[PDB]
Amino acid sequence: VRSLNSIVAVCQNMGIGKDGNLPWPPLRNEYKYFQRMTSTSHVEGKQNAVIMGKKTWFSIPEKNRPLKDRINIVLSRELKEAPKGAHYLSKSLDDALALLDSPELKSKVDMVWIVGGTAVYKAAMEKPINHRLFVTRILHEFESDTFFPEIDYKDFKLLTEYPGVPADIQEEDGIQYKFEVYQKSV
Ligand SMILES: NC(=S)c1ccc[n+]([C@@H]2O[C@H](COP(=O)([O-])OP(=O)(O)OC[C@H]3O[C@@H](n4cnc5c(N)ncnc54)[C@H](OP(=O)(O)O)[C@@H]3O)[C@@H](O)[C@H]2O)c1
Numbered sequence: 594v595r596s597l598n599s600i601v602a603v604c605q606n607m608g609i610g611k612d613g614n615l616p617w618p619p620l621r622n623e624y625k626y627f628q629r630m631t632s633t634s635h636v637e638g639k640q641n642a643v644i645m646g647k648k649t650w651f652s653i654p655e656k657n658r659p660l661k662d663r664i665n666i667v668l669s670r671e672l673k674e675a676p677k678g679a680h681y682l683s684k685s686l687d688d689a690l691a692l693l694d695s696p697e698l699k700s701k702v703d704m705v706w707i708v709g710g711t712a713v714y715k716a717a718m719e720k721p722i723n724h725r726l727f728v729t730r731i732l733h734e735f736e737s738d739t740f741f742p743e744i745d746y747k748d749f750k751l752l753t754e755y756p757g758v759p760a761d762i763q764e765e766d767g768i769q770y771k772f773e774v775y776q777k778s779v
Pocket residue numbers: 600601602603608609610611612613614615645646647648649650652668669670671672683684685686708709710711712713716739
């Protein structure tokens with residue numbers, strides 16, 4: 594595939610989850626951002642693909658599965674078949690990448706988004722391919738049991754601006770956050 598996109602929300606301690614959920618209570622606007630970025634294809638007749646770990650998949654309320662308007666691919670070394678509602682199951686990122694290139698998919702897919710968790714982000718980060726990381730930095734700390742892997746600031750250059758991404762510090766529910774885009778060129 595040409596390039597990857599990863600999206601995540603992190604707090605000050607780099608936590609991304611706690612007890613099978615997000616460490617903070619609901620933020621409406623941040624959520625809509627994720628929906629908008631992951632769902633928006635720039636080609637008619639094509640849809641985006643989202644890739645995610647098993648834990649992540651099960652974290653989404655069942656009635657909300659699969660994420661509407663995207664091809665959901667779950668990764669698992671243990672499952673035998675895609676969980677009820679997922680489009681495809683893959684045993685590794687590589688496998689997932691190959692499937693995407695498959696003829697049946699290739700023409701059906703616009704963008705590939707990596708939606709975590711940890712191991713998923715890590716794996717994608719290490720692929721020597723063009724990659725854009727969309728980070729929402731929540732400017733507070735919350736107790737977390739799961740964390741975002743360390744990004745190589747030598748590879749991933751923070752962009753100072755990106756089309757459609759608000760620049761300023763945002764606030765909602767008394768919480769401040771900022772959007773940042775990092776880009777790796779291969
Ligand atoms: N802040 C944001 S935006 C965000 C985004 C995603 C998740 N979360 C949170 O983080 C937690 C879920 O994340 P996590 O890191 O614990 O779990 P996940 O990555 O979602 O799930 C882990 C499992 O997925 C499979 N897997 C993961 N990476 C794999 C790979 N490269 N190849 C094959 N299978 C792989 C394995 O399943 P098997 O054991 O079956 O092999 C592994 O046990 C929840 O609290 C969720 O809310 C937060």
